[PDB]
Each structure stands twice: as C-alpha cells, then as structure tokens.
C-alpha cells in the first residue's frame, strides 16, 4: 500500500521542492540529494541512479510513495557521508547502554540512596598518549573504559567512577561542601514552590498581580557573599525571579520587579522574601514568535551539493580535506573536538588534542535586590550540552548542513537522544586567496572552511558556537548571542520621565517601562593545542617602533621584541590585539629554521562592544571567585582533572577552583604540554533594535599556522619532484 | 540553429545538462532559466516562456535559434535589471560625457599636445538638491559638470566643463601639486632603465647575466625635506628591480640594494643608489598552479531559481528596506550614495555618501631600497582604473550578479571594466533565534547584501565589501591578498650567520626571502546624515562605579555619556570597549531616546591590529598622513574635502589631508557631520604566505542605536 509523499518526506525532516516544467521533485536531507520523477522506475541519489520497485505516483495532483521508499532511498547506500567505524574510537561518548550499565552499578551499591539524582555521567578519558597513539599508530587502548558518575544526593556530592569493561564500582567519593548544578526538576520545584506560597501569593496580589496562577517563576543561583546576603552557605538555595505571563509567549517582557523569593531545595520552602518598592508590571504584548507580524514574500536561495559531501562521517570521526577530528557530547560543556591533526603531504601532524567550551559567564551590573547576586554561569551551574537547542534546519545551519543526533544522559540516569544537536556544513567563504599581475592571466581559487556549529539555551538567551576549520590550516572559534534580554521594570515610559534617569542608570530604556540591564557576556575556551607534539613553549612577539640606527633619512624602524613566557603566573594576561603570541615547538622547524607555531588570538573581533575585562571593582566577590573573567590569555601544564575556568564546583563557591587554582602553583611551561584558554567577552548595553527579541551578535578568536608550514597551504599538491 | 554550448559559454552563461530529467538550466547573473530538449516553452526566473523555435538535440549536441538568447535572456522576464527612465544626478559621466568633456578642454588655447588625464569625473550638485531627488523625485535644475584634472608634462591644471551647454567653465594651473602615477610612467621607466648603460653596468656587477630580464617597479618618492637628496620640483619616481626567471613571479626575485632615481620629464635616471650586493633568490616559486594540481572537490551552488530580492535600474539598487546608489570613480572605486532604510514605508536617511576615502601601505625597514617605500595605493596609483574584474564564482560566490562599470583612461577614452563589481546575497546564520524550554522555537535566518570591489595595485590584491543587514547595520570589510614585497637576503634558514640582522626588520619566509614588515591602513569617507542632515557626536563609555545604592554590592556597571563638540577632540583612538554615536539631537524613537548610528571603527581582523602609525612622531609620513594614527575622524561637511592623505599626496610636504580639514576645530553640534574611519593591520610575515598570501580581513560596522523603536526585522504589524 502507499503513502502521500509530502506530508512523509516533511515528517521524515527532508527539504521537498516539485518543479512542474520538469515534471521532477528534488529532496534534500543532509548528505542526501535527491531527484525522482512519478513514474520513473529509477532516481538519483548524489549523481548516482537507484532503482525503485514502486515508482512515486502522481494521483490527482498528489505524489505518493511505497511505505519503505524513505528507507530504500535515504539508507540505500549512495550517500557517502556516513561510514560504519570498524575499530571503536577510544573518545567515543558513552553509548545508551555505557549510560544504562553505569547507572545499575551505582545502584548497586549498598550506600546508593533512591532520591538520588546524576549531575554528569561522562567518559573518563584514557590517558592522552594511548588516544594519540590510537589516532596516529592506531594502536589499541588496553585501558578499560571507565565512567564518572557525579552524584547529587538530596545536595550532597558523591563522585564515583565505574569500571564499564569489568561491570564494578571502582570509587565512590563524596565532595564535601560542593553543591551541585541546578537540575531540571529544580525548575518545577521552584514554581510549585511559589504556587503554594501564602506569602509570595499576598506579596504579588499587592505588586497589582490578580490571578497568581499566571505567575512564571525562573531559578537563579545565589553566588557567594561571605554571608552579606544572608545566606546559610550550608544550605542548598536558588533566588527566584518572577514574571507574569500575559499569553504573548514572551513572560520575559512582564518583570515583577523588586520581588525576590529566596527557596530551599531540601526542605522544599521559601526560606525568605526580598520585596523592594512596588513597580507596575509591564502589560503591553510583546511576542517575538511573528504571530502579530505580516510574513513578507522573499525569494528562494538554497545552498546545494548535487553530488554530496566533501567531508566524511565515521562513526565521530570527521575527515575533509587535511583535516582529521573526532566529535563527542559533554553535558556539561557541549562539543570536543578531538585529535586534531592536519595531513600535511602525507604525514599527519598533530594540532590539537583536545578543544571545548572552557565554561562562561553572564554577569550583571545593576546593584538592586533582584539583580545584585545575577550571575550565570551558563555551563557550569545549568548545563549546556543538556540543553543543547535542535538546529532548526536550514534557519540555524545553512541548506546545505548535516545535522548530528548526539546522547548523553539526563539528570535521572536515562540516555537522552538530542535530535539534530550539531550541525556540519562547507561554506563558500570568498577568495582563498588571489592576485591579478596586470596584463596576465587572473589567479585565484576560492576558499572553503568547514563549520561545526552547536546551539545551547539556558533560559532567556541561545548561544551559539562555530568551530571553523579553514583549508588552510587556521582555526576560527565564533560565539554568537541572541535570545531574549533579562529587563528590569522601571516606572519611565520615556527618557522624559522623571524617574528616567535612575532608572536608566544601569542599563538603556529598551522599551516602555523596560530597561535591558547592562550586563557582559564572557566566553573562555579550553585548547589543548600540541603543536606539531606535545612539549611546546608559550613565545610572545610585540611588534614595536625603534630608533633607526642603520644610517638614512628614517628617525625610526619597525622591529619586533621576541621572548619566552617561563611560567603560568606570567602567561596569564591581557591581550593586546596589536601584539602576536605563540604557542611553539621548540623541537621542531620548518624548512627556513622557524620553530612550528600555532598564532593565539583571543580577540579577533566582535559586534558588541568587546570587554575589556570583568566589569567589577576587584573587591567583589564574583570578581575573586572567578579571576578567568579579568584576563584574555591564559597558558598552563595539562592535567586530567583541570577543566573549567569557573572550576568544577561553582555553585556558591566560596574561592577559584578554576583557572586562578590551575596557575596558582605558577608551573613551568619552557617545553612542556601546555593548555591554552582563551577568554573573550562583550559588554553589552543595550539598545530599542534588541527587543523583543536580539539579532545574533557575534565574537571571533582565531588560530593559525605561524611557520607551522613552510608555503601557501593550498597551494596544492606539487607535480614534480 | 547555432550550437548551444558553444553560443551559451561565449555569451558567458552556465549550461548544466542533467540527463535523468533531459534538462538544462542555464545561469547568468539574474536570469535563471531552464529549458528542455523539443519543448515549446522554457522557463526564466521561475516564470513560462513561449519558444519561438525549440532547442533541438544534434547527434547529442543541443542547438537553438540565432535569436535564442535575445528572446531568452532579454525576454523581460529576468526582472534584476530595470529602465532608468529619469537618471540619478550621481550617475558617473558616461562614456558621451567622458568624450565630450575632453573636446571641450581640447578646443580650449591653453591646451597643450600631449596633456594627460589624471581624473575626469562628475562633479556632483548640491548635496541639498540630490537628496530631494532621492527622497521627493525633484529634479535637480543645474547642468551635468564635471572636474577634468589634467596632467601637462608635470604640471596639474584643473578645469571644469558644462556638459549640458557644452562649455569650459575654468582653467586653472595647480601650484606645486604634483600628478599621481599614470600608466604610460610604468613603460616609460622600465624603458628608461633598459636604455641606461650606467644601470645595465650596475646590475652586471650584481650577478644578473641578461639585462632583458629585468623587471621594473615605479614608486612614489615621498618627501623628506631634502634628506634623500631628491629636488622638489622634478616629477620623479624611484624604481626597485626584479629578475625575470621564468616562473610568472618576478616578485619573488628581488635585486636588493639597488634603486634608481628617474625624472620623467628628463626622462632619464638621475641618481642611482646601491647598497650591498646580494644575490638574487632564484628559485622557482610560481603561484599560477603551472606547477600544482588541485585536489577533486564535489560541486557546490548557491541558486535563485527565482531571480533576485534586489532590483537594479540604471545604478540605483533595491533590496528589502534598503535604497542606495552605487557608481564608480577612478581614483576611489564605488560611491555608495543618497543610502535610505524604509522604515514602515518612510524612507529615513542613513548615508549621503560613503566610500574608500583612501589607503596606504607604509614599510618598516630603513634600508636603500625601503626606507621611502610608502603606497598610496588610491592617491598615487588610481584604485578604480585598475580594478581587477571579479572571477566568477571564485572572487564571489556564484549567486552574485557582475556590474560592468565605465571610467576615462588617462588618454580621456572611455574605460568599460567588465565585472567590476559584484553583487550578491548570502545566508549569514540565524538573524535571530529563541528556543524556549518546552515551546516552539522561533528563527529567522539573516541574509546579508554584499557590494564587493577589487583593486589591484603592483603586488597587492584589495578586496572591499559593503554589506547592508536587514536589521538596518551596515558593515565595510577590507581583504588583503596577493604577493608579498620581499627583500633579498642571504640567509637561507634562522641559523645562518646573518639570520638575525636580516630578519631585523621582518621574517625569513623563504631561503633569502624576508617579507619586510608593514602596515596596512585603510580609510573610509562615511558622510552619514542620521535621520537628517544636522547631527552630534555623542560618547558612551562603559565604567565601572562604586555603589550607592544599598545592598552587597560594592560597584556597578554604568556609563559616562558626553558629547564630543569638536573637530579636534573627535580625532581620536577607537577604543573597542567603548561606544561612539553620530547622532540625530533633532528626532528620537517612541523611548525618547536620539535616533543615532554606532560607529565601530575596529569590529575586528584577522592579522594583529595597528594601533596607530608605527612610526616615531618625526617621520615624515607620520607628519603627512596624520589619519594614519587615530581611529576616528568627524569633520564638518565640505564639497571638497573627500580624501583623508589629500588630493595631491604625491611629494606632498605636509598634510593635505585629515589634517587640514581638521585643523581649524570647528563645531559639531548638531550639524552635518562627514564621519571617518582609519582601521589598519601591522603585517609580520610567515612562511604560510609565501608564494601567493591567503586572503586576510578587518571588518568594520555601523549599527542603528535607538534608530528604531524594537527588532526591524520582526516585520510589518498585520
Ligand atoms: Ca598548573
Ligand atoms: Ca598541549
Ligand atoms: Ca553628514
Ligand atoms: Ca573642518
Ligand atoms: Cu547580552
Ligand atoms: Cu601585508
């Protein structure tokens, strides 16, 4: 029997187009391009023609299809894209059943308590050099796949690590005073919490709220104080910011102003209410979703690559031109990329061992009872991989992507499939490179990267990385913004209101009534680059103007000051755009002698104004338990255990676990596997084009090839010789 | 009949044949045509089309009428181009006007008989009157003039002629002003050169066997108040040879230390300096791929199967809410001009002009043959006249659309310059996106339109963006590319003796071959009328203050706001942390806020940022090219003020340009203000870009604030 072929093909997430001059529907779905007229007993898959039993039949101006069409087209095998991995990749994330297993041997243990609950179940990583060996040499990893198993019992840590390949508990350590990550049940909690609040009720009746009921209540984390919140340290807390929900899709734009309630997780109560002087709530309808918009007629444009790929899929492991990866999902962090290498005339040189999202921040500047401790630690206390966002086809990724399923396990224990997670896709990005002598033949080719793109939303804001692979060799990591803007509700309706200028002292008056309290959006990369090996050294290049003392009319010269950076302390610093800082191999040359070096540049760019460093007095709390925020560059030895730039544990930390923890021994870093992070920020005030809803913005940080090659990368494989 | 492919490939459209669906879909630009073997009708731009004669298949060969394309392409169907029935007063002279214009200096007694051209451009009405046109369809009532710059010898006249009552208006001799470099000065010096027995001795002595192989390079002189020894009033030009080996790149054979000075007028060497005799690098190193074979890739295409969202009659483009007017000069490249968003149907001013407002490419090394190294790439060289035609689908994607563009040659004859600019509309990510938890997710993708504009000066490719944004931000992005100017050397690797001084002043990219240090400086001319011809420029910087509000807070995140009132004080460094508005005092959006433009001179760049001029404040460039050294510019606006190294920056003894406009501090408040943006790249080479460099960019940006009242890409209210 058959089925209609375009409410299927929609449903299967396949991109339909009918041309009716040539009688032809063109299909597209990832690797898969596909062409197929009714009737014809064969179509075509990437170029290459597929027979067809049952043909698609035109009935009555509708196409159908046999039941089994998508599969016999789209897995029959003429797509490239993906290929079957034969050996198991040592990185793979923890399948399904890794998740499962891991789960059953922590409840196998006589101290396993039934509320508890899994902030992170990830691969515990095999030692570095088996990986490389296993990328390099293909040489097995004779190391048992083992698994960490971060516990949270009612808001007490366990960390336990379990041996997957022999089935048994391995460890079992609780982490005293760390809290744990907010967790999605946390969320419900806290709204039902408020909803059966007598008070919070009677405090938002007389805030001019009528029906309660309507009342959408979002967790923050409290941060750390030193008790000047008044805040047991002990206790496992959330502050809770209020909106009303007016059915425009958008409670954001409804703030309930100067109303804080403070809850205990564990004993399930509000533990405290912070109420400020009363401010109307912002009623007007704002939806961003267009229902109240006119959908303006565009043209179509599409992206396409008749043929399929240039790049290939392998189980994880991705292969386009020079470029060897493998792709992995964390939780906590999202994407790492892994076993980076780049092919250089047959030898396959080593870049990076392993690249991520470090950790980030989005911290507030408005001092007021609902803003003062606002602080979000997107990854760290939410976690981003969990609430990766699906890439919406063909709007978050060009026509021409594929889009990646990734698994990782939810807060219970059970495996969670996240449908079209990453997407991969080629672009066109202008000349690679050209020169036109003139009166000669014109040179130029054109320039392709390849992009790994991932999405993560974590309340009101969705954010957006690009890991950008050049041809040639260069590295482009881009973090874009959007969402919608946290707001304060102010009694302005103007800048020519009497309160106007109070209430715009901390952030612009974006809307009536509505202020986008200023805030900065701060990104920190963690690259464990190995140029070209492992032992590399951190060198800087200032470019700078000197008397010119070789005789001629010049007064000065431009020369370069060029020296090592020993140790972590000094490595972590500013960056200054105009200066170059390398990461080089001080065993290894190209063929002019040069050490083979990777260019670090934290600050290529931005769209929002760029932050300079943390907008706080160095006094601050946040300002000391976070120092990865005030410095662009940071360099230190690789260890295991040292991942996150906020440092493992950061709710209510009371003291830098992470980069300021990493340095502090202020290790030696002359020849030795170092780790780079990059820190890259933007201040963000805000602005009417911003709301309802904000354009991306975008941040750019680049890596490339200094002396790393010893030509033009692309220019191609030499003909003779 | 006429054969298909063959009549198609000359016409210069893609013919792709697709056997599974016997049918060609043919490309050119806008037209997007499909067509099938026996039909009676095609398509163009997703639109039928009744086929006088149908294409016909000939022993597997396709054939179509004599009249095909004609009937086909200019059927009407392709809508991207339309009849300008009444012309903007921007459009540059024609070809006619070009030719009129010079007969008309001609006929004149005080032309001489072998007078050059160096600029023969339009000379534009009022600023007042073309806006009305733009905004009210008002005619502008003043005859087509135009600045005819010509060249006697070496001496700079400029005249202005009426074109409409086909007249000569004035005639005047330049004092001093010296001429910028014309094409017949290159042939004119390399010819020079091989008549010099002096010069052929000296290259002798420096191992060159076959003085026919050498390769000249003519560069400006610049001045040094007499320090290089060179006389003032002389049009001189000084020469850096190459050898000639055979590999399509005599860059990469430099003859270092020996540079000669020549007179033009004299036409003759006038002083020859050699320094040390180096040997000339000789190994091959082409970057023609004669010696390279590309790796297979599989085909990729960016189509529009129904034509375009922009429209283009006569210059004047239209895309989404965006207007503006794009034409070409000589010396500059593209205008673009009289730049209007439809707000909600109300057409709101943003830019009465903007263009490259000029460059330069200052050197580090203090040596014989770089010590006075400084191109004014657009001042001196004529960045227009030599645009590079853009290779389609290669220097632009393949959905773009070619404009030819028409200029004088320094003879006066019209100039057609095939595919001088590109225009095309490119997906770039998600305009903006909100996934909230449990709820449909809402993203709109964002579509960008880019006018890119190559240049190519001696070595160097430059590539110019102008990207207009839905939302109302607009961008200018600079690409750098091309052949490195390098400096012979002896050292082959780092650890030669002479390593360390002969990478002083650059890096060893090459055995003997340093890629001397420089600087990459750009600078663009942004008359931007914000809502309105009378603006301010108003700071907004980013601090952080102590806190007085109560609570645990000890500081807060605000801003110090101030306006800059000005000339003087809005010479300044662009610091990226901080904000920087041309505003509108006279209108505000529905929050009462000054409807205002964000200009970020810095958005970023992929080789390290010039923080200023590397240079010591006494050098003479520095005292000539004061724009060099700050980030940003405001000037009152002036007719005659468009270039920020001056008009005559050849030999120039002092600043004629940023420096004279700004000098006499005028105010800013509230008036038409003309903004400036200096943005450039301090370049340390590397091995990666020798042969041929790999394309490097700066972007630059200019965002609405508070122009409009929320998101201007959420749509029209039903
Ligand atoms: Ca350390
Ligand atoms: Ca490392
Ligand atoms: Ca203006
Ligand atoms: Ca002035
Ligand atoms: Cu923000
Ligand atoms: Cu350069």
New binding site residues.
């Given amino acids: 029997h058959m089925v209609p072929m375009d409410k299927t093909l929609k449903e299967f997430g396949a991109d339909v187009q009918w041309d009716d001059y040539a009688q032809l529907f063109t299909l597209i779905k990832d690797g898969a391009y596909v062409k197929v007229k009714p009737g014809a007993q064969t179509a075509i898959v990437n170029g290459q023609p597929l027979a067809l039993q049952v043909p698609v039949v035109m009935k009555d101006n509708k196409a159908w299809v046999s039941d089994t069409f998508i599969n016999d087209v789209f897995q029959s095998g003429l797509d490239q894209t993906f290929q079957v991995e034969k050996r198991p990749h040592p990185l793979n994330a923890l399948t399904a059943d890794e998740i499962k297993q891991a789960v059953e041997i922590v409840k196998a243990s006589a101290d396993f308590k039934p509320n508890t609950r899994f902030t992170e179940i990830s691969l515990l990583p095999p030692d570095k050099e088996a990986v490389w060996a296993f990328a390099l040499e293909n040489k097995p990893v004779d190391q048992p796949r083992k698994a960490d198993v971060i516990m949270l019992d009612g808001k007490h840590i366990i960390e336990a690590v379990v041996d997957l390949q022999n089935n048994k508990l391995l460890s079992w350590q609780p982490i005293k005073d760390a809290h744990g990550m907010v967790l999605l049940d946390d969320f419900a909690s806290v709204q039902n919490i408020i909803n059966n609040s007598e008070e919070f009720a009677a405090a938002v009746k007389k805030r001019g709220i009528t029906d309660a009921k309507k009342v959408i209540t979002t967790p923050l984390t409290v941060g750390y104080f030193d008790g000047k919140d008044g805040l047991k340290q002990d206790a496992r807390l959330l502050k809770v910011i209020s909106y009303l929900d007016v059915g425009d899709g958008n409670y954001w734009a409804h703030p309930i102003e100067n109303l804080v309630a403070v809850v205990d997780l564990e004993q399930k109560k509000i533990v405290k209410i912070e109420e400020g002087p009363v401010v109307p709530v912002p009623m007007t309808a704002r939806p961003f979703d267009g229902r109240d918009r006119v959908a303006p007629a565009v043209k179509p444009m599409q992206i396409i690559e008749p043929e399929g790929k240039n790049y290939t899929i392998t189980g994880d492991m991705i292969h386009w031109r020079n470029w060897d990866f493998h792709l992995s999902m964390n939780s906590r962090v999202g994407p790492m990329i892994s076993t980076v290498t780049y092919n250089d005339n047959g030898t396959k040189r080593k870049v990076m ?1 392993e690249g991520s999202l470090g950790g980030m921040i989005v911290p507030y500047g408005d001092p007021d009872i609902g803003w003062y401790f606002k602080a979000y630690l997107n990854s760290g206390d939410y976690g981003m991989g969990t609430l990766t966002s699906p890439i919406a086809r063909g709007k978050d990724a060009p026509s021409n992507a594929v889009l990646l399923n990734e698994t990782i396990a939810d807060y219970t224990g059970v495996p969670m499939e996240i449908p079209r997670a990453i997407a991969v896709f080629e672009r066109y990005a202008g000349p690679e490179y050209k020169h036109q002598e003139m009166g000669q033949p014109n040179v130029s080719t054109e320039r392709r990267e390849l992009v790994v793109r991932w999405i993560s939303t974590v309340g009101n804001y969705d954010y957006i990385f690009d890991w950008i692979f050049h041809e040639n060799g260069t590295i482009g990591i881009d973090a874009g913004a959007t969402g919608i803007e946290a707001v304060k509700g102010v009694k302005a309706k103007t800048m020519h209101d009497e309160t106007a200028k109070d209430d715009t002292r901390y952030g612009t008056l974006i809307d009536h009534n509505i202020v986008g309290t200023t805030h900065q959006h701060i990104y920190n990369f963690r690259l ?3 140029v070209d090996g ?1 032992n ?1 050294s951190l060198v800087a290049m200032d470019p700078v103007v000197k008397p010119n003392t070789a005789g001629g009319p010049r007064t000065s010269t431009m020369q370069v000051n060029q020296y090592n950076i020993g140790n972590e302390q000094d490595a972590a610093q500013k960056f200054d755009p105009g200066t170059i800082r390398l990461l080089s191999n001080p065993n290894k040359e190209n063929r002019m002698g040069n050490p083979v070096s990777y260019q670090i540049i934290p600050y290529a760019g931005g769209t929002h104004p760029v932050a300079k460093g943390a907008q706080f007095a160095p006094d601050e709390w946040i300002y000391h338990r976070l120092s990865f925020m005030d410095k662009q560059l940071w360099v230190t030895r ?1 260890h295991p255990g040292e991942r996150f730039p906020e440092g493992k544990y950061p709710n209510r930390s009371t003291h830098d676990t992470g980069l300021g923890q990493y340095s502090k021994d202020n290790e030696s870093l002359d020849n030795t ?3 780079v992070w990059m820190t890259t920020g933007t201040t963000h005030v805000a602005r009417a084009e911003e709301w309802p809803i904000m354009p991306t913005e975008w941040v750019h940080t680049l890596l490339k090839p200094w002396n790393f090659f010893d030509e033009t990368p692309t220019l191609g494989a030499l003909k003779k010789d």
């Fill in positions: 061992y464990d680059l190995d492992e590399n690789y596997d170092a780790v």
